[model samples]
Target: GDGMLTVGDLVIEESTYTARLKGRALELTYKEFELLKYLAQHAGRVFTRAQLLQEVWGYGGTRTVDVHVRRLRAKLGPEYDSMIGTVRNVGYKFVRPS
Candidate 1:
């Protein structure tokens, strides 16, 4: 079945490999989309970089998660970038604004 992960105004359509924030389409790489989807699915849950590397990349790579997260935030834009929150000296998490 088609999968759709929605958090507030952010919508992710796994069936179409598409994501939209505030009704604006987001241009995301496969990895980016996967990362976003993973985080969105567990909103408010923090994940360490190591955890993300394993979950999103399916392997390990130093800084790869950081780079991807940075890019994802940039793509998500200013107003919406806060959806992905950074935990200093820890990792990242998804936050759906109320």
Candidate 2:
């Protein structure tokens, strides 16, 4: 999927089960990968935690979305801080190009 996500000189590729980041093969739990994939699919759209829960986690009522996002950010590193944007009272957006 590297070719599917190339942007300029950077390539954001993910396998069916994992993601490649900074030359490291980062393993992602099912939920983590799903969440990341959902955001990437909708790169510039801000999604509420509720929306994420329904769209990514397949749940209706849960706060786990926040926790998962935090963990995902940590796994992605400091350079990805702005990749997942916090919209204050709203939600998040995957804004970085690569």
How accurate locally, in lDDT, is each candidate?
A: 0.90, 0.71
| Backbone clash pairs in model 1 (N, Cα, C under 3 Å; residues 3+ apart or in different chains), count | 0
TM-score of 2: 0.77
Per-residue lDDT of model 1, residues 1-98, tens digit only:
46987898999999988999878999999999999999999999999988888888885366888899999999998989899999999899998899
Q: List, in order, the clash count of every candidate structure.
A: 0, 0
Clashing pairs in 2: none
Alpha-carbon shift of residue 71 in model 2 (angstroms)? 0.3
The number of the candidate with the highest lDDT is: 1
By TM-score, who's the top model here?
1
**Worst lDDT 10-window in candidate 1:** 53-62
